[PDB]
């Protein structure tokens, strides 16, 4: 089959890794950056600690986004069904299309909701429009998972 | 804690020091230590020899078990004891350098069989023994440490604890690990 | 010969890219921007919903990016052309590196008129007039987009 | 120098596929045919030594971070030197993730015969255990890291105040779900991998 | 601690050529072993002698 | 914070062990119902100054011992944590100390001016500004044979680049425009030092605090010269630093300020230091604001500007504990509480 | 055939043999970053 | 598998036995230090013993 | 061989660059001189809406660059000319990168303007006549590629 | 099936697995003793306490020796690529884990001994951290000695 | 096939780099370590003789790449396998590259160690115990190179 | 085939080597080496015949270099093998990048032992010891390109 | 044996041998001349004593014109390929090391310079060691000489 060459499965592994490796590399970016700004008001008003671990959830919900995309791509290689290159073209544009996605969102939501920790502890006022920007910081992977589970059940 | 770890810690050490003739000349130099603790007692230690001497049975019964376990390998520095009767025998006839199974005679007695010394797949078996071996006293040294978490919990006379901590643990590791330690010995028992 | 079997590569690529380079834009123009209204709200905070028309105008840009992508993805095929692939992947090109350009300058324009307009009530009128002549860099990229991948299967052959 | 140099491989690189593509050759620079014709044992021996190697060099990485920090911020308050060896922990969890990933999937590793050798399951298996090398390998790497930086930040919370440990532990169980989130994802890549033959 | 060396020299080495000389399959029974075991054992024997001078030198020290 | 705990894991770490020991608002409020010396000495021997008056001994304990001692142990904890610093950091430690060897410099050759003795015009000198030919600053009077003789090699030499040496030896008003000129460029350079080679986390919060120097020195300089001071504006623009937030809008009407409105008017315009020149004290409106502004950089982790916050507050806090021991040394309690606490 | 001069093996010796090159740089570069603290050495 | 069984028996009643016969002395550390090293020597001898009793590979070497 | 199969990806790319190129310098120039306008009419907000024609300026060569765009794209075909293809190539890196120095030059002229016409009024007059000359200099790529675009599809065959 | 060009990469494991493991035991050492000698000037009977990080460092180029004669000892001028690929995956395991342990002990080294000097309470907490750095060569070790016994088979 | 003509290539490459790369870490170790000597010999020159040890255990290093280069340089020929070829490259890289480390090492540890053991005495023995650890590693990448060098030439055809 | 066309390119590039590289570390060590002398010797204008011997040893290295640049070149030719043309490049590569090494070696020793040996007359014999140590590497590279430049044509067919 | 790229190399070499030593000659000059500029203006009576430095780095660009001008009158279309890796050979031995010989002469220069007004006996110590930088550029004069002469001497 000239549709299927045997070496099509490498573009859907790198797809693997692609939506895998950069949606975590984004999800620690953004639970790492923003655990600075979260444990750097650990002094200076300890009680808004509890209150400020959202940037981190968010951040990991970003991992889950590339969790979602990677099984949905392992799940379709198998060395026994044929498997065109077509389909190993989609899978590697599915999994750098939600890396990236994630990988900007993460920088996103590190970047915001440290600062917005650190000047939380003198505005209490500041936490609506902290988690406002950080959900308009985190729908940037959602985005990026919406593109790659119509491009996953397109190319197919 | 420190009433388990006078056998565990030795052992646990013995199973990765596995040695009769390093495991010998570390109980020697623990055996000297101890028939001398009354001259090295009113002595100034500095902290080494402080830390070696404070542990001088410990490294006894590091010593005493690692000559146990090396006796149970056949490793005196790294060479096999030909002690008990062969579990396999050679064949008698066979053209010089090419590659011979053994035949199974038996089983052999006491520790690892001698005959995977000079042995080219000899460290696959090993590398299958030595971890099932590594997964089992794993198993046991938790499922033992994890009854004495009943026992405070009964001591502090706790049934919310004992039902919300200890049985939800307990059939919880059992049912998993508890099965992959019996599924080991399963594998061992059948031919 | 006309329709290779490498032909998607190029449209994937360009599928790929209207989301990687426009929602780094978008999240530049989102993180550079919040970190103005974190900074001026903590002395200002009536004006913490009116600052946060930089991060939302960033977020068109993702949603122009989202658009055009999904735009792509619904004319890839396996028996595609390879001048498809190579219309998809400028309409790719097209969105992401003009999305990009446009998240930068919202989110270096949007932090100091945050800056400003907490020193100036009179100055928002002013930063939402720059932020709409930088928003309409990505709607030119997302114009150019939609004229060229509306011309990606019209006398295409074999 | 350096980016001299990026731009002289780029330079060359575009000089080299547009004379291969103007003068009618351009299908002679084939990825397809290179991904054909190379042995899947290098990709399946590089993705086991990199999934064991990046696992380690995170590891290593975030050990690092958050045990100079330990030690620094030990110095006035010395009853946080045992107590938040858990961030230690953590961080070197990832290591031994790589390492049980890597001995699965040299189980894999036999010897294939030479007239089915660059078949379709052979060289599958060799792609599958690469980028399952290579996504376990940078995830604990990234993981590593993260777990290293958000100990490094509660080494020092933890001798500030004794009662931040515990509000900011929550931030290296947060960064440590990466690693085994690699390492469910390297072992569904190489599910359906078969051994070579 | 030369004579704790030398002990073991004449202990160790005592043992490896007495096994050389009965023709034990763990020092003579593989084919890139020597093959004739007691002129192995002789070589060693006298090694063995060597760290006892050794062992005895040291001993009045 | 990826590259940052290879050279400064160690280094960080101690002085946020160090800012710990800074006093809390209770710590001050227990130092000021204090009724002797001898009681804020034992009242300060429970924080982490313990027992550092401990060779005094209730008897020869003044006021300005306790302000000796407890600076000398800041001087002496900043160089424990400058002699474990290597590269960029040490460079950066030295840079610090450049700013103290300048008022030095300009201490000392006042002190052979007016010919008062080697001896006891050097302990009056920081001990952190040390350079190996500080004392020999009493050889000379004029500027060119002090700069071509001693601060040839010293690292304040890169410094006299503007300092205009007319053959006039050295009167009290030409040193403090020395001075001036001096510390002007040396914001400068450890301005371009700090955007150069520091890195990121570290760089957006220390130019916030040098640009806060540079300002205070500009207000400062702009304001002492109404009273002491009759100099045209083209040659009072070469004593404001150009580095900060009031430079290139601002110290251009300070420096044609000729009256206290010329200040005021100018300093009206800038957003964060209007007000100062209006109501209290304004070198406490200058310490408040150094205070805020070395607060919220120690709650950036990963950066190396965490020690000028931690010196500048430790500094802070001597000066507190010297306001509290001189009030409760007089017998003056009206103003107490006039101390700076946001740790 | 894959080419006559960047055959199917040397093009994967100069994979290898990249690979442990960026290794060896980077290894290279972060001994290279190696200063001393000289304050800690000197009397003063 | 019934020589392991066998040797539990053996090991298992001697542990009892000496359980019951601990010297009064230090009996938590009596007690506690035989009665487990017995343990760990028959899990590691019954480890040992059931890995070669029906072995699945065969040692293979060449030079012989 | 005269008009080959990977023909119009020169003709795309040119396409593509023909926005991208000229957007990421209209961006700078939004940027730049955005930063100058928020910092400078803090004191002075009466002059916010004069002070804002760098920003028009630099979105007047997004449209120079949005034309070419278009006018490329309307001339992209399965089967067309090699030469149409450098020849749009040609046309989309003329408007880009002189677009892009053009978005360069507004951008430092145009903050230094602004910052400049508060002190003095005189000034903007002045900034008006730089910143003709630095926004002429996208009018010249535009002019170089509409005169090659009028080439592209003139007398080609096959 | 076992090309003119299979015993470059295990050569080059052979290399590689010396060459890295030795870049991070020099880093452990040198970084390390920085940190011994400047100690050491004004307390230095914690001298051969603080001797620690270096052996561990040796450790680490014991492991790598260790794998290098072993992958020097099956090599031919005839193996297969899977040999030779095998020997590069043993070569690159150790070396990459032998210089992350080697880079770990050196930096966590120093700051240990550093902290020992003010807090002698530091000493446990650094022995114990450099344990944690030590293991990782070990980790690399044994995909090194696992991939060695899967040569010739 | 087995003895190609582009073969005493590599063999020439670790005949240079053994030679090469053991000289600049010598040579480090000379320059970092002797700075500090000039350093501290200006105050207390009377124990200029005895910190002159990181210099020598630094050229030891050029004399561990010298030994390997001559056993490559004598077992190069012009119809030589690939092999051999390949097994040369390895044992110039395994001494030089190792090497390279241990020079750091003694340059980086001699530097810090003359410069403190002029203000402490007692820390001149830990130095040596230091470098003696920083010189094995040339002396591991030595012994790498030695049984490279034994298996280059041994079956070949 | 056994002496193709392209086999003299490595032999020139070797002889080319061999003296740019060497002339490159030499002339750091009389650059930096005489940036000291020209800052001592101002204080001490009578040490400027005693403190020339690290641009002496620094001109040894390119004597060095010169002296196998000149026998690789009259072991050139045309139709030469591809076997003596790899020798050769190794040749030119053991002195130039070895002496570049020692040139390192003694420039950044001999500025410091300039500077400090005007102030400490009694560093002078442990500068030059010092020097002698750095410019044992370039003549540890001489010695491997010239054992090597004599198997270049040794039964070479 | 003798191709029709050969004279490629050969027009490098002759390139090469004058680019490299006006690079040299040229950092030689603009350091001595920074040197002579800032050291003459108190004491201009040594003005012409100070510009042996700049014209010990005009001797290595005529070192250099003289082998590029030897082996551009030895180029020709029918040339071996010998030839013209001997003249590259011949031109970088000249050129690299030219360049070479012009950085220890500009750096010695300036530094010699700055320091001879105030130390009159330097001078004599300045010239020696520019003898010492200048002669690393007669090395390479001398094996571009020994290479050129022996670019058509058995050549078919």
């Not at chain 2, 199973?15 to 009113?42: C, Q, S």
């Not at chain 2, 078990?65 to 149970?72: I, K, Q």
Request: glycine share 8%.
């Amino acid at each position: 089959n000239i549709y299927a060459p045997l070496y099509a499965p490498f573009f859907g592994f790198a797809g693997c890794a692609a939506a895998m490796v950069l949606s975590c590399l984004g999800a620690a970016i953004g639970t790492a950056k923003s655990g600075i700004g979260i444990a750097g008001i650990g002094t200076f008003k300890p009680e808004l600690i509890m209150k400020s671990l959202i940037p981190v959830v968010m951040s990991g919900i970003l991992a889950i986004y590339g969790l979602v995309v990677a099984v949905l791509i392992a799940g379709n290689l198998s060395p026994t069904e044929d498997y065109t290159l077509f389909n190993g073209f989609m899978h590697l544009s599915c999994g750098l299309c939600v890396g990236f996605a994630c990988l900007s969102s993460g920088y996103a939501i590190g970047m915001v909701g440290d600062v917005g920790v650190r000047k939380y502890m003198h505005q209490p006022r500041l936490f609506v429009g902290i988690v406002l920007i950080l959900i308009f910081s985190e729908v940037l992977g959602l985005y990026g998972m919406i593109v790659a589970l119509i491009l996953n059940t397109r190319g197919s | 804690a420190g009433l388990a770890t006078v056998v565990t810690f030795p052992f646990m050490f013995a199973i990765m020091f596995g040695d009769m003739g390093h495991g010998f000349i570390l109980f020697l130099m623990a055996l000297f230590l101890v028939l001398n603790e009354r001259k090295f007692g009113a002595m100034h230690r500095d902290e080494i020899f402080d830390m070696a001497f404070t542990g001088r049975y410990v490294l006894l019964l590091m010593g005493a078990f690692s000559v146990y376990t090396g006796l149970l390998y056949n490793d005196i520095f790294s060479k096999s004891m030909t002690i008990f009767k062969s579990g396999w025998q050679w064949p008698s006839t066979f053209r010089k350098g090419e590659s011979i199974e053994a035949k199974k005679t038996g089983v052999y007695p006491f520790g690892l069989d001698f005959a995977w010394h000079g042995t080219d797949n000899g460290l696959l078996f090993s590398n299958s023994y030595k971890m099932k071996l590594s997964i089992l006293m794993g198993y046991a040294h938790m499922t033992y440490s994890f009854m004495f978490s009943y026992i405070n919990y009964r001591a502090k006379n706790s049934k919310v604890d004992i039902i919300g901590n200890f049985i939800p643990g307990l059939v919880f590791m059992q049912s998993i690990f508890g099965y992959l330690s019996w599924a080991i010995v399963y594998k061992w028992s059948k031919d | 010969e006309l329709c290779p079997v490498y032909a998607p590569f190029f449209g994937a690529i360009g599928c790929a890219s209207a989301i990687i380079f426009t929602s780094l834009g978008a999240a530049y123009g989102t993180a550079k921007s919040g970190v103005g209204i974190c900074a001026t709200c903590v002395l200002r905070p009536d004006l913490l919903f009116k600052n946060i028309v930089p991060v939302i105008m960033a977020g068109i840009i993702a949603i122009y990016g989202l658009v055009v992508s999904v735009l792509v993805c619904y004319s890839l095929g396996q028996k595609q052309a390879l001048y498809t692939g190579f219309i998809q992947l400028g309409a790719g090109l097209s969105v992401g590196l003009s999305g990009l350009a446009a998240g930068f300058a919202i989110g270096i324009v949007g932090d100091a008129g945050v800056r400003g307009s907490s020193q100036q009530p009179r100055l928002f009128v002013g930063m939402i007039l720059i932020l709409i002549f930088a928003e309409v860099l990505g709607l030119y990229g997302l114009i150019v987009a939609l004229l060229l991948n509306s011309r990606a299967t019209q006398d295409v052959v074999c | 120098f350096s980016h001299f140099l990026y731009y002289l491989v780029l330079i060359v690189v575009i000089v080299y596929g547009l004379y291969k593509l103007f003068t009618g050759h351009g299908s002679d620079i084939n990825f397809g045919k290179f991904l054909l014709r190379t042995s899947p044992y290098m990709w399946a021996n590089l993705g086991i030594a990199l999934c064991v190697g990046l696992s380690v060099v995170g590891a290593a990485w975030g050990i690092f971070i958050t045990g100079s920090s330990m030690i620094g911020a030990g110095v006035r308050a010395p009853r946080i030197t045992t107590k938040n060896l858990i961030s230690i922990i953590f961080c070197e969890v990832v290591a031994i993730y790589g390492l049980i990933i890597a001995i699965v999937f040299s189980s894999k590793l036999t010897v294939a015969t030479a007239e089915n050798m660059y078949s379709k399951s052979n060289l599958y298996t060799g792609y599958s255990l690469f980028w399952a090398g290579i996504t376990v390998g940078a995830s604990n790497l990234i993981c590593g890291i993260a777990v290293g930086i958000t100990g490094a930040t509660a080494a020092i919370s933890d001798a500030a105040d004794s009662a931040l440990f515990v509000k900011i532990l929550v931030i290296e169980i947060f960064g440590s779900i990466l690693g085994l989130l690699g390492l469910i994802v390297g072992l569904l890549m190489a599910g359906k991998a078969s051994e070579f033959q | 601690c030369c004579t704790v060396l030398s002990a073991f020299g004449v202990v160790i080495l005592s043992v490896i050529a007495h096994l050389f000389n009965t023709n034990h399959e763990s020092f003579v029974g593989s084919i890139n072993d020597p093959e004739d075991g007691p002129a192995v054992a002789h070589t060693v024997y006298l090694a063995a002698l060597v760290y006892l001078v050794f062992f005895v030198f040291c001993g009045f020290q | 914070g990826v590259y940052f705990n290879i050279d400064n894991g160690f280094i960080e770490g101690v002085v946020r062990g160090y800012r710990n020991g800074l006093l809390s608002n209770n710590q001050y409020i227990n130092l000021t119902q204090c009724d002797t010396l001898e009681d804020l000495k034992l009242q300060l021997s429970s924080t982490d100054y313990g027992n550092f008056l401990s060779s005094v001994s209730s008897e020869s304990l003044t006021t300005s011992l306790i302000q000796e001692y407890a600076s000398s142990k800041l001087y002496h904890e900043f160089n424990y944590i400058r002699d474990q610093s290597s590269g960029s950091t040490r460079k950066f430690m030295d840079y610090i100390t450049y700013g103290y060897m300048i008022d030095n410099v300009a201490l000392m050759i006042t002190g052979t001016i007016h010919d008062r003795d080697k001896g006891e015009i050097l302990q009056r000198c920081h001990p952190l500004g040390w350079f190996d030919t500080l004392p020999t600053l009493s050889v000379a009077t004029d500027l060119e044979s002090l700069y071509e003789t001693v601060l040839v090699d010293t690292p304040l030499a890169p410094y006299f680049k503007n300092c205009f040496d007319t053959a006039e030896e050295l009167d009290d008003m030409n040193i403090e425009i020395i001075r001036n000129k001096l510390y002007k460029a040396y914001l400068e350079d450890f301005y371009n030092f700090v955007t150069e080679e520091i890195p990121e986390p570290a760089k957006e919060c220390m130019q916030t605090l040098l640009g806060f120097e540079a300002d205070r020195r500009s207000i400062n300089i702009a304001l002492n010269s109404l009273q002491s001071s009759d100099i045209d504006p083209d040659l009072k623009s070469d004593l404001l630093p150009n580095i900060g937030k009031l430079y290139p809008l601002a110290t251009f009407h300070l420096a044609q300020a000729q009256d206290f409105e010329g200040v005021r008017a100018a300093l009206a315009n800038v957003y964060e230091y209007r007000g100062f020149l209006e109501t209290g004290n304004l070198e406490d409106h200058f310490y408040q604001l150094e205070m805020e502004l070395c607060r919220d950089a120690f709650t950036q982790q990963f950066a190396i500007s965490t020690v000028w916050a931690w010196m500048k507050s430790k500094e802070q806090e001597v000066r507190n504990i010297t306001w509290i021991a001189e009030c409760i040394a007089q017998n003056q309690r009206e103003r107490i509480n006039n101390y700076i606490s946001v740790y | 055939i894959l080419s006559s001069i960047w055959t199917e093996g040397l093009l994967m010796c100069l994979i290898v043999s990249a690979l442990l090159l960026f290794i060896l740089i980077v290894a290279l570069s972060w001994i290279s970053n190696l200063d001393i603290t000289y304050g800690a050495l000197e009397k003063s | 598998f019934y020589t392991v069984v066998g040797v539990f028996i053996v090991v298992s009643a001697m542990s009892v036995l000496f359980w019951i016969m601990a010297p009064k002395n230090n009996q938590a550390v009596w007690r506690s230090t035989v009665i487990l090293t017995l343990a760990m020597m028959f899990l590691m001898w019954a480890i040992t013993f059931l890995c070669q009793l029906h072995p699945l590979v065969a040692p293979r070497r060449s030079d012989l």
